[PDB]
Design a protein around this ligand. Structure first.
Ligand SMILES: NNC(=O)CSc1ccc(Cl)cc1
Lengths: 9, 273
């Protein structure tokens, strides 16, 4: 697995 | 006169929130952040006490920017033909908590305890001021690396706090609670506690526990890192599937894992300097 950001909305 | 009161520096970032530049207040060399939001992109509007129609983000920032707190404060704001410009505090030096956790991996529990405590105090401050953030996550937390203080940012998905049900949501889905996923309904404080459970897992394990809707509503919490039984218990309590089974903020801060928190200055000296 990779860690990632998650955009709002 | 916006362009004559601040010297604008490089772009710090952009996204769903707008575009944010580094800046310096010309009056006294105070570091600031200058956030631009296009009017056509603003969904929620509100009214300041003066009655002038502004983005809800401005309403909420003004409600929480009085006095000292763990919230990045709104120093001023400007209206342009096609946009609003927000002048915000800028810690220096600074790193957001998402990048910090990426670089450091899972945090020592002593450091996670200090960070999580400060976030709880910041969120309590918001709720005390009648403001629900609705997008608590590591990306929306800044670390003042010299002072060891955490600062909450981005009220662009927030709302006035209320005791009735919310049926709208524009925050981050992987931090949103199972009742939102399942029913498109949540209450403000118990939804916030869920997102704090996600955040605490993120701190002590190095990433969030859930990526998919099925994991969020399944409510099974697997620990990928060694985490004390006391910390596991608090996380699992915050991530209770039924909202009324989640702790209040008082119960979180009275939890055995939360006692003997470091001061911010101690946190910086031991862990950040
Ligand atoms: N989702 N991001 C935002 O709303 C950016 S607000 C902000 C304030 C101060 C600094 Cl140093 C950086 C950013």
């Amino acid at each position: 697995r990779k860690r990632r950001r998650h955009p709002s909305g | 006169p916006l362009e004559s009161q601040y010297q604008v520096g490089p772009l710090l970032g952009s996204g769903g929130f707008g575009s944010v530049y580094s800046g310096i207040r010309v009056s006294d060399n105070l570091p600031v952040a200058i956030k631009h939001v296009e009017k056509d992109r603003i969904s929620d509007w509100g009214e300041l006490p003066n009655g002038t129609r502004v983005p809800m983000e401005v309403v909420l920032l003004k409600k929480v920017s009085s006095g000292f707190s763990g919230v990045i404060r709104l120093l001023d704001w400007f209206e342009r033909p096609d946009s609003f410009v927000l002048i915000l505090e800028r810690p220096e030096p600074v790193q957001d908590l998402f990048d910090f956790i990426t670089e450091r991996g899972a945090l020592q529990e002593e450091l996670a305890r200090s960070f999580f405590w400060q976030v709880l105090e910041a969120v309590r401050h918001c709720h005390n001021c009648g403001v629900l953030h609705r997008d608590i996550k590591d990306e929306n937390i800044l670390i003042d690396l010299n002072r060891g203080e955490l600062k909450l940012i981005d009220f662009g998905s927030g709302a006035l706090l209320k005791d009735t049900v919310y049926t709208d949501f524009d925050g981050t889905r992987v931090y949103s609670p199972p009742e939102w996923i399942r029913y498109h309904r949540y209450h403000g404080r118990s939804a916030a506690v869920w997102s704090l459970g996600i955040l605490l897992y993120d701190m002590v394990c190095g990433d969030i526990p859930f990526e998919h809707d099925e994991e969020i509503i399944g409510g099974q919490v697997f620990f990928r890192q060694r985490v004390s039984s006391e910390c596991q218990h608090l996380i699992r309590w915050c991530l209770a599937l039924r909202p009324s089974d989640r702790p209040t903020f008082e119960e979180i801060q009275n939890h055995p894992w939360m006692q003997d928190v470091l001061l911010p200055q101690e946190t910086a000296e031991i862990h950040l300097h």
